[PDB]
Amino acid sequence: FLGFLGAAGSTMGAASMTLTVQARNLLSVWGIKQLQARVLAVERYLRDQQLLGIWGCSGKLICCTNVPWNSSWSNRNLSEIWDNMTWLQWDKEISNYTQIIYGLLEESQNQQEKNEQDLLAL
Amino acid sequence: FLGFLGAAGSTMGAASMTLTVQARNLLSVWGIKQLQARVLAVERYLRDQQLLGIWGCSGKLICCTNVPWNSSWSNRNLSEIWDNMTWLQWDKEISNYTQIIYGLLEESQNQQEKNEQDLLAL
Amino acid sequence: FLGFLGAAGSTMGAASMTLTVQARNLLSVWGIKQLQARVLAVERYLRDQQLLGIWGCSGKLICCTNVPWNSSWSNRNLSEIWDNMTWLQWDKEISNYTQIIYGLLEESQNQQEKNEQDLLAL
Amino acid sequence: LWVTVYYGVPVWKDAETTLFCASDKHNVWATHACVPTDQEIHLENVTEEFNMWKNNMVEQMHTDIISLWDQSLKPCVKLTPLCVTLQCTNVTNNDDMRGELKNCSFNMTTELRDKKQKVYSLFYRLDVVQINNKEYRLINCNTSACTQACPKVSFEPIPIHYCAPAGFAILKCKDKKFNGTGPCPSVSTVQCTHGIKPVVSTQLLLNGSLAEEEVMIRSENITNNAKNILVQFNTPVQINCTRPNNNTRKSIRIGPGQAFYATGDIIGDIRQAHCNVSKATWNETLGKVVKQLRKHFGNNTIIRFANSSGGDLEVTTHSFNCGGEFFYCNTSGLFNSTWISNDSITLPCRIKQIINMWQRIGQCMYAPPIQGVIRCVSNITGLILTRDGSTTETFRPGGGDMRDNWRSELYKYKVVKIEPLGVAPTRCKRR
Amino acid sequence: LWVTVYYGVPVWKDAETTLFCASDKHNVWATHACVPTDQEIHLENVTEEFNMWKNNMVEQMHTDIISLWDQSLKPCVKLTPLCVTLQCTNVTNNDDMRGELKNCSFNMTTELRDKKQKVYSLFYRLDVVQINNKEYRLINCNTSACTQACPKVSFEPIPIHYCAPAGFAILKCKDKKFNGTGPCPSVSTVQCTHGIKPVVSTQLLLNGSLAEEEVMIRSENITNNAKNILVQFNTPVQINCTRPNNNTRKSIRIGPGQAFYATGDIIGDIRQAHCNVSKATWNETLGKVVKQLRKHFGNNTIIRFANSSGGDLEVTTHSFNCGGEFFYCNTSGLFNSTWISNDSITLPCRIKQIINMWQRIGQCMYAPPIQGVIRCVSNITGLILTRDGSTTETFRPGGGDMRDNWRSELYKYKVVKIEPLGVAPTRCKRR
Ligand SMILES: *[C@@H]1O[C@H](CO)[C@@H](O[C@@H]2O[C@H](CO)[C@@H](O)[C@H](O)[C@H]2NC(C)=O)[C@H](O)[C@H]1NC(C)=O
Ligand SMILES: *[C@@H]1O[C@H](CO)[C@@H](O[C@@H]2O[C@H](CO)[C@@H](O)[C@H](O)[C@H]2NC(C)=O)[C@H](O)[C@H]1NC(C)=O
Ligand SMILES: *[C@@H]1O[C@H](CO)[C@@H](O[C@@H]2O[C@H](CO)[C@@H](O)[C@H](O)[C@H]2NC(C)=O)[C@H](O)[C@H]1NC(C)=O
Ligand SMILES: *[C@@H]1O[C@H](CO)[C@@H](O[C@@H]2O[C@H](CO)[C@@H](O)[C@H](O)[C@H]2NC(C)=O)[C@H](O)[C@H]1NC(C)=O
Ligand SMILES: *[C@@H]1O[C@H](CO)[C@@H](O[C@@H]2O[C@H](CO)[C@@H](O)[C@H](O)[C@H]2NC(C)=O)[C@H](O)[C@H]1NC(C)=O
Ligand SMILES: *[C@@H]1O[C@H](CO)[C@@H](O[C@@H]2O[C@H](CO)[C@@H](O)[C@H](O)[C@H]2NC(C)=O)[C@H](O)[C@H]1NC(C)=O
Ligand SMILES: *[C@@H]1O[C@H](CO)[C@@H](O[C@@H]2O[C@H](CO)[C@@H](O)[C@H](O)[C@H]2NC(C)=O)[C@H](O)[C@H]1NC(C)=O
Ligand SMILES: *[C@@H]1O[C@H](CO)[C@@H](O[C@@H]2O[C@H](CO)[C@@H](O)[C@H](O)[C@H]2NC(C)=O)[C@H](O)[C@H]1NC(C)=O
Ligand SMILES: *[C@@H]1O[C@H](CO)[C@@H](O)[C@H](O)[C@H]1NC(C)=O
Ligand SMILES: *[C@@H]1O[C@H](CO)[C@@H](O)[C@H](O)[C@H]1NC(C)=O
Ligand SMILES: *[C@@H]1O[C@H](CO)[C@@H](O)[C@H](O)[C@H]1NC(C)=O
Ligand SMILES: *[C@@H]1O[C@H](CO)[C@@H](O)[C@H](O)[C@H]1NC(C)=O
Ligand SMILES: *[C@@H]1O[C@H](CO)[C@@H](O)[C@H](O)[C@H]1NC(C)=O
Ligand SMILES: *[C@@H]1O[C@H](CO)[C@@H](O)[C@H](O)[C@H]1NC(C)=O
Ligand SMILES: *[C@@H]1O[C@H](CO)[C@@H](O)[C@H](O)[C@H]1NC(C)=O
Ligand SMILES: *[C@@H]1O[C@H](CO)[C@@H](O)[C@H](O)[C@H]1NC(C)=O
Ligand SMILES: *[C@@H]1O[C@H](CO)[C@@H](O)[C@H](O)[C@H]1NC(C)=O
Ligand SMILES: *[C@@H]1O[C@H](CO)[C@@H](O)[C@H](O)[C@H]1NC(C)=O
Ligand SMILES: *[C@@H]1O[C@H](CO)[C@@H](O)[C@H](O)[C@H]1NC(C)=O
Ligand SMILES: *[C@@H]1O[C@H](CO)[C@@H](O)[C@H](O)[C@H]1NC(C)=O
Ligand SMILES: *[C@@H]1O[C@H](CO)[C@@H](O)[C@H](O)[C@H]1NC(C)=O
Ligand SMILES: *[C@@H]1O[C@H](CO)[C@@H](O)[C@H](O)[C@H]1NC(C)=O
Ligand SMILES: *[C@@H]1O[C@H](CO)[C@@H](O)[C@H](O)[C@H]1NC(C)=O
Ligand SMILES: *[C@@H]1O[C@H](CO)[C@@H](O)[C@H](O)[C@H]1NC(C)=O
Ligand SMILES: *[C@@H]1O[C@H](CO)[C@@H](O)[C@H](O)[C@H]1NC(C)=O
Ligand SMILES: *[C@@H]1O[C@H](CO)[C@@H](O)[C@H](O)[C@H]1NC(C)=O
């Protein structure tokens, strides 16, 4: 056990076994200021959980999806990503490709929603 | 792309392909006004997410359920519902039966929650 | 229909028929007193949904896990728990074993998260 | 056996939280700081432990009744100019109401800053303190300035329901022999409480809720004489007030837009203000109280009711509000009896206009005169007794702490926190 | 390769947010506007970039320390009646404390509006301005009215912890050579900061946190002479205050419930208020400062310490609070030396009662007299220097901006926003 953000400097493979530690800490003059800090924490948490549900990843911490990895985003191989890079370094590399990936996941699930809707119709 | 509420005049079949657009827009003296509106937006969002959870539809935008359609709620066939009406016209038609269906979906899931629960005990 | 907390005195078997009754009632300077109570209910509800999500139980009122029931927590047989005890009596008996169970459920899910993630790449 | 997680189990823990008001001419405890109302579910086989003496609804209601009191007094007149020197003479110069009054003349500010105003008013002797037609001054003038009780807000208590937020429930004890503590066999989950009128009074619980079958004695520790005894009647004892005088309210413009309402003249029936309690009804009510009070001290003990020991006028008298004017009744003929194993009782009441209500110093209030004759019909639904520290037990009336008044209405209620996430063994196994 | 979504990745961005107070007799920065406290996690291989000069915690703490100051002054006396004409005579009519005082007599309001009160008080010459026994008036009377420093609230700073809300983290730089900017090899995630005492002072960082290994020089741009230099000591320099006089506080009732506390008499040791700094300890501390200060300007340069240039008394003097009474010490013997490649220093301090603390106009405060002798023990844990725009560099003391005082405590902390949603390639494929 490392603690909150303990694996920030750890490799992506090693830091992915402690996702629960960071996940559980995202939810919980000194009056309204302290009260609006709690409402901001809930709204920030709820819009992240909404994104997971839209991508079909609701209730999951590691969600393998159907969107293929465009090599333009990152040409590195798996060995030097999950064993040589940390999540802070990785976020810097793909910070500009984040929004195009988000749209790809959003539409891919929307296609899967109608694909399973038609399969159940038979 | 049409935008938020853009498919309001589109037929029910065409407007059901843009659910992610409306879903992501439901979450985001004079200081409580801003703050109390935010808390009410979070509360309303959680009420609709709770309903989907107790119907077995959590994390889904299109959720095919086990509740049969009585035809006393609407006698129209699928051709004239998903290709002629819009979601606003449809909403004004089954508004009377909304709480009848909302009770059947909850009851069906609860029975289905235990039939699957009793199946794992074998 | 017994109502909210109606099955509080019923046996654990009969009280489990009505989990949705209590579930839907957990969510819904004088303005701040009301406003701060609303925020407390939201973040109290979300912490329980987050716990279910990290155990692989999100969106389910009854969730089956892969954690075997250590007899140290309670050695009473299945017949004298679901037909003789009420939920209030049960909570007082396993109150001190609650946190160790919570850690086991969290450790059981992320083990299944990685095992399914590994098996899905084959 | 495997762990299975149930969400929504009917499990609750004791909790302290902020309950919001609900209610169904502005008021002190107005509906503008409350919510419209709309219910009760019987929880069978549930035996919960209540404690009316460590209940946080009582402590919160005390804060809220105070808070709505101050919030209703800020927007109206502050009587800083009323600290002038008063040249007061007697009204009668000779048993009547007029022997309680001083005819006080003073210079008052006008709506124009540079002009004065020689005015007079009839002040009760309880509100003026002599300075050494003598020279007097208002009593709460070296401690604070008296914000005038605003004439358009009423002191009449309206019922308020304290309703629990989401995730909490209010447990109501339906047991009819429930004293204040221990298990309660019959429990219910109410959305929120019955209408609790915040009647402010001492030594007597005016109006409110009666007992169901017999007079109930409720003390935190009946063997401790430092703890008040909250008696609750089963049949109310009706008490009738009056101020027979036909008062004449007079308006003085002490500034731009600010008016000071003064007693200009007093005519009519000049008998002292009094309350009437039926002598037969009160005697049989003390008989019921004594019968239920020998159960805690013995059958052969001597139950004696004496009158209040001493202290402030707010604690030695049945202080209350009736018709917008504040009374302070003696209640020494009510509590005067020794009990061994058409007629009426008249309680002489004084009246004050400068009120330090919530046992505080530095925040007074000037209750303006009420035009006309004041008449009053209330139910004595309880008592607050103190015991004296021998075969004779003496029970003097008590009070002072306003929380014991609302502790008598919130004794049956309890706030719990729902714990909907519970784990239990089952033959399940996740696939 | 396929996109796989990871929720909960340890990724953070820089953010500005509202950190809430936490703390472990009412205070100016009281615990009624804070939260009880309860922690530190070492983040290995993490090298974060800090910037103590564009840190928003410093800007927020300045707002909050001000906000708690005003919030603590509203409920107590406003001295509007103290703007009368004062007939002031000398106290000594001849080096002492009594040469700093004027014996001022004035008409004051009584608790009765129509009566006056011929009273007197000893006012410092720094608080009275002559009108042309001469005629004087209080200094902040054409700009505002002085809300009296409420006598039951203490000015003693209690440690406050600024704690980040959910979704945010506070990064703490554990590097011992970290000046104020650039990468920090050793970082930690604290739940929230160490107890930061809001000590308000100028030219000298009284109390607070020491450096770890050597005196630290911290400037936003060391080559820019318009930027203050925040020196931080490794060993504290103890400074002892005093006001030797035995003051006699006197109470004046200026209205109903309002009292004005005045200096009625002064007896005892009448030596001027002063602070003592050990001459040996201060000389070796400036030696350490000079050694660490030649690293930025050259080994052969001449480091000269001069005294404050000019301006307000709050900026030319070591302004601070000690024992509830506000001192203004010269510190011209502290900063007087030229450095080439048992004894004590006594700093004469003046005292004021009318305080415009946060470099503002229109909100003064009257600090009431403190009964008795005032004694003081503080640690000089830092400096605030300004450089003069040649082989000689002259470093005058600086200050004025209160943010540089708390910038010296929040230099090691940083607030980040957790970004828990990250995507990465993996051999997965959704089934
Ligand atoms: C109202 O004010 C008047 C003055 O404006 C007061 O009359 C004065 O009383 C003093 C004695 O205290 C005399 O010495 C003056 O000669 C009086 N002035 C007159 C009569 O013009 C009067 O007493 C005040 N009334 C009160 C305080 O009730
Ligand atoms: C304000 O004035 C009243 C009246 O003079 C003070 O109360 C009196 O106190 C003395 C001294 O204990 C008693 O002998 C009197 O009987 C008291 N009078 C009444 C009517 O109670 C009171 O103490 C003063 N308050 C302050 C804060 O000075
Ligand atoms: C107890 O309750 C009675 C009944 O509500 C109160 O008497 C009423 O007072 C209002 C306002 O003064 C009048 O408009 C009603 O006509 C009164 N009713 C009767 C039957 O007289 C009484 O004031 C309450 N006692 C208190 C508040 O001490
Ligand atoms: C309250 O009633 C009592 C009793 O009537 C009054 O006080 C006593 O009265 C009896 C005779 O009526 C006297 O023998 C006592 O000496 C009285 N005790 C006193 C005056 O202390 C009392 O005056 C009434 N009013 C108050 C305010 O107590
Ligand atoms: C306090 O007020 C008195 C008057 O109430 C002042 O005395 C007056 O002073 C003026 C000169 O400015 C004379 O012309 C008057 O004759 C005086 N009146 C008297 C003595 O009754 C006195 O100067 C004031 N004290 C102050 C301002 O400190
Ligand atoms: C309030 O009065 C003070 C004192 O007269 C004013 O400060 C003086 O300003 C003049 C003109 O610049 C200087 O010569 C004096 O040396 C100042 N005196 C002090 C003690 O600083 C001040 O300017 C006035 N404020 C306002 C807003 O009018
Ligand atoms: C620096 O810290 C010291 C120690 O806390 C402060 O001195 C204390 O002040 C309080 C309140 O005046 C006294 O009760 C303590 O007895 C003092 N301690 C000692 C050792 O003298 C000092 O005031 C602080 N310096 C400031 C705030 O400028
Ligand atoms: C602060 O100390 C300085 C230095 O002691 C004082 O000012 C100078 O003092 C020297 C000799 O002590 C004189 O030669 C200078 O002419 C003084 N300069 C002045 C008076 O401007 C100073 O008086 C002390 N106090 C303040 C408030 O500056
Ligand atoms: C830091 O890196 C070392 C190896 O370079 C590794 O052993 C260690 O686990 C890393 N730190 C953390 C917190 O994982
Ligand atoms: C991959 O990204 C490039 C831009 O970086 C884009 O032009 C291309 O269309 C993308 N390919 C796919 C299959 O999305
Ligand atoms: C409106 O109706 C027309 C045909 O009637 C359709 O082509 C169009 O898409 C509709 N508008 C929207 C926004 O879908
Ligand atoms: C349809 O609803 C009616 C009542 O409106 C009910 O009587 C009927 O049984 C329902 N149909 C079915 C198939 O259950
Ligand atoms: C209380 O217990 C009885 C039997 O002991 C049972 O029939 C009843 O249903 C229980 N109450 C509730 C609310 O279930
Ligand atoms: C059950 O819990 C006890 C601790 O009370 C522990 O010693 C035992 O090993 C546990 N049984 C298991 C893990 O099978
Ligand atoms: C005024 O009344 C008091 C009490 O009633 C009395 O003591 C006093 O003598 C009276 N003053 C007169 C008659 O002048
Ligand atoms: C109140 O009643 C309960 C249950 O009968 C009893 O245990 C308790 O002792 C009573 N209260 C007192 C103060 O005796
Ligand atoms: C009280 O009773 C007396 C006679 O005993 C009567 O004169 C008076 O009017 C009554 N007052 C009230 C308010 O009933
Ligand atoms: C009180 O007054 C009512 C009428 O208002 C009358 O019927 C009743 O008899 C009176 N009771 C007493 C005790 O004065
Ligand atoms: C209680 O009654 C006695 C006489 O019986 C009296 O002297 C005393 O003042 C009374 N106390 C009160 C009414 O508080
Ligand atoms: C007193 O209570 C009775 C019923 O017990 C009620 O009819 C009457 O109106 C009440 N009087 C009041 C509240 O003044
Ligand atoms: C009062 O003191 C000042 C400064 O100390 C002096 O200039 C003045 O002459 C003194 N007034 C006298 C002695 O009357
Ligand atoms: C502070 O230290 C960092 C790292 O050594 C350095 O890059 C930076 O220039 C220093 N600050 C200044 C103002 O030079
Ligand atoms: C400062 O030192 C002087 C002598 O140098 C001494 O008289 C005085 O008491 C000292 N004051 C303090 C506060 O140490
Ligand atoms: C300050 O005072 C302390 C005792 O309070 C004393 O031990 C110390 O030597 C003094 N130091 C200076 C520099 O005056
Ligand atoms: C600095 O010292 C000089 C003399 O050395 C003095 O004239 C000047 O007033 C001082 N400035 C201050 C203390 O601000
Ligand atoms: C000064 O710091 C020392 C330790 O460096 C400490 O023992 C002493 O109490 C401090 N003096 C204060 C805070 O007055």
Numbering used by the authors:
A (entry chain F), B (entry chain B), C (entry chain D): 519 to 546, 570 to 663
D (entry chain C), E (entry chain E): 34 to 57, 65 to 78, 82 to 137, 148 to 185, 188 to 309, 312 to 323, 323A, 324 to 397, ...
Show passages lifted from the paper.
On the HIV-1 Env trimer, bNAbs recognize highly conserved epitopes essential for viral entry. Here, we report on the identification and detailed characterization of the new anti-HIV-1 bNAb 007 targeting a N332gp120 glycan-independent V3 epitope of the Env trimer.
Structural analysis revealed four trimer classes with either 0, 1, 2, or 3 bound Fabs, with the most populated class being a 3.0 Å single Fab-bound trimer. Interestingly, EPTC112, which recognizes a similar epitope, also lacked full Fab occupancy in its structure, with only two Fabs per trimer modeled. The observation of sub-stoichiometric trimer binding by a bNAb Fab could result from a weak monovalent binding interaction, which is unexpected for a potent bNAb such as 007. A 007 Fab-Env cryo-EM structure revealed contacts with the V3 324GD/NIR327 motif and interactions with N156gp120 and N301gp120 glycans. Antibody contacts with protein portions of Env are mediated exclusively by a 22-residue CDRH3 which extends outward to contact the conserved 324GD/NIR327 motif on Env.
